[PDB]
């Protein structure tokens, strides 16, 4: 099952994947911008079976830097990531979602990272929850400094696929 | 004019089966001049690696189902040829850790000590190409693998502690893919040392180095690691 992880720069896309699969992510520390990469992870579904997921890490999206359109043409599922401290990161989750619908069933999980910076928040939980209900996707407010936040969204994605 | 046009279109087509795309991607590699392929690789790096990786993973599971056959080895040898062409034509992106993890794990599946000798030598050959492009931008681990490519040498020392090639490859609910031998063997330093030197000499003589010719920079980086870990214990 091919999964595309996409979001704005430094929202935590690679930290989520690496802290999920290895738990060795130290916050801050090594900072290298991602370009393209694939992680292999097996996820226990809710039944208890295991599905092998090809997690394609993406280069951070930016003003003038859009997602390649061929990801839409092969991705089985999407992990959309914003940072709750960055409103624009959430705004890009929305526009990516509208793309996903246009460019052709798929599984989408929206993650809200860096909630440990609650006092530094720029994405209200209520507005994010309401958008999740409106687009009929599942949205978790998670953080990389606490791995337990990450498990729930990914087991749900695996159960779909 | 149909062969290249028709084959190229299918390789670029995302809807087409990745297996079908590989068939025609290999066709391009055999009939297209190197300078032409380099520009093709530079333009379509993202999807070409997608074709390689999905097909490689595809073959891995096949080898673990049908077992090792003649036909499987044909396919495997083809995938690595594409793999090599990726390592040759995209050093600048590889240098920037483009598919750092997927390439790393893929090489670890060849370098696993349970593999047949042929595959293990193939892993060494491709690893050195990866490191020559990765150069200084490599992480610590790649150095330790380089210092452990040859069994029997004094156990390497890392930041966490002592390590071996087998420790570097294979240290409740969700777990990452565990590396397993691609072609398990079926029922020594003289040897793998010769392999390491034999391949490093070939890389020195290797032609068609990128116009930036940062291959020279990487090879000397490769040499310093060789000077640090293997040369001291050589007569
Ligand atoms: N405090 C805190 N920092 C976090 C959290 N998640 C990620 N970070 C930090 O945010 C930075 C960016 O993380 P990284 O995974 O490299 O982001 P990316 O989105 O993969 N980068 P790009 O989009 O440029 O490829 C790192 O310094 C990381 O430690 C989190 O939950 N809390
Ligand atoms: Mg990244």
Numbering used by the authors:
A (entry chain C): 5 to 108, 112 to 168
B (entry chain A): 7 to 177, 184 to 199, 207 to 254
Give verbatim excerpts from the published study on this entry.
κB-Ras1 adopts a canonical G domain fold comprised of a six-stranded central β-sheet and five α-helices. The N-terminal domain of RGα2 is composed of 10 helices forming tandem repeats that are twisted and have large loop insertions with short β-strand and α-helical elements. The nucleotide-binding pocket of κB-Ras1 is occupied by a magnesium ion and the nonhydrolyzable GTP analog 5′-guanylyl imidodiphosphate (GNP). Finally, a large loop inserted between α8 and α9 of RGα2 (V157–F211) folds back into a binding groove between α1 and β2 of κB-Ras1.
Via interaction with the RalGAP (GTPase-activating protein) complex, they limit activity of Ral GTPases and restrict anchorage-independent proliferation. Other noncanonical GTPases of the Ras family are κB-Ras1 and κB-Ras2, which were originally identified as regulators of NF-κB signaling. In contrast to most GTPases, they lack a membrane targeting motif and a catalytic glutamine. κB-Ras GTPases not only show intrinsic GTP hydrolysis but also have fast nucleotide exchange rates, which shifts them into a constantly active form at physiological G-nucleotide concentrations.
